[PDB]
Amino acid sequence: YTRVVWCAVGPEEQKKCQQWSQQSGQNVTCATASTTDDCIVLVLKGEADALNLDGGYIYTAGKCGLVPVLAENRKSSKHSSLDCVLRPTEGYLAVAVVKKANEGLTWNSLKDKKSCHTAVDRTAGWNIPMGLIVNQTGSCAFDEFFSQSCAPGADPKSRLCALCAGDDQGLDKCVPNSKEKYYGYTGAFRCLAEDVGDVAFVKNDTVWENTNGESTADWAKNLKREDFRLLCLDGTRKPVTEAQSCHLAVAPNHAVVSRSDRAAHVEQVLLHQQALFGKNGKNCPDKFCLFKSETKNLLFNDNTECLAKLGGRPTYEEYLGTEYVTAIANLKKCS
C-alpha cells in the first residue's frame, strides 16, 4: 500500500492535517495550498491524492477528471438501522439568513444590501443564490447587485470583497481559506451576526450550530436563534425552525475527490482512518478526532458523523445531480 497525501487549504487546515498525519503513523501525509482550486491542481498533477470538497468545487474538480470517492454524512433526520457508512446521504438545505431586527428585508428587497457568502464558487454561499439572482434579474451583472459583500475568492479591490476582514493582522483579505475572518459557513454567519452584512448565504445547520450556546466562541456564544429569520423565495420570512419549507435549494453533501486511479486506495485508507479517528472511533476523543476542529470545519465539516460509501459508482455529474450541474453551467456563462 501507499500513503495517502491529503491536501489542506490554508495554514489552519495544514495544522490539523499534520496532527492527523502524526496520529496515523504517516499513513496519511499533507500537502498544503492557499486555496481549494490550488489543491485541485496539486491533485491533478499527482502531488496530492485527495481532499474533501463543497459541491461547487466538485464541479470544478470533476470537469478536470477527478471523481467523488466518499461523501460526508451528518446525523440523519430519520432513524435508520443502517450503519452511517452505508446510509444514503440527504443533502443539506441552502438558506438565506437575516436578522429578525432588520424588518422588511425579504428576498425581493435584496438589491443594494450587504451580503456575506461562504466563498465564490461554493454551493450555498454562491452558486445557488447568485444563480437565482442572475435568473430573476435577467442580468449577468451579479457583481453589482449587492452594494458591498464578503465573497472570498473575488477580486480584493472589488465591492464583492469590501466587507471581508482578513486575518488578525488584517492581511489576506478575501482569500478563500479559514485565515479570512468571514470565510466559509461559520465566517459568513459571523459576518451577519456582527451586522457587517444584511444577509448570509449559508446552510441550515450553520444557524443552529452557532446559536443558543451550541458554540462557545466569543462572537457566537450570545447569539439566539430567535433573533434570525430565513428568507423564502416567495418573499416571506420565517423562523429558522422552518428551513424545510423556506430554503433556496437542497445541496449535494460535501465529498472527497481524487484521481480515478487513486480512488480505490483513497477510499480504503479513509474507511480505516475514520474507524480510528471518526465519531466513536477507537482513538477519538483520546488521541485525535478527524471531524472536530472547534467549529471551524477544517478538512471536514464538524457535523460529519462519517464518510459514507457512494451508490452506483457515480460520476461527478451523477453525484451533483443534473439540475445542479445545469444551474452551475448557466451561472458560469456570466463570467
Binding site: 470537469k63 478536470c64 458560469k332
Partner: peptide, 6 residues
Amino acid sequence: LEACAF
C-alpha cells in the same frame, strides 16, 4: 460548459 479550468 466544456473543458477543465486549468
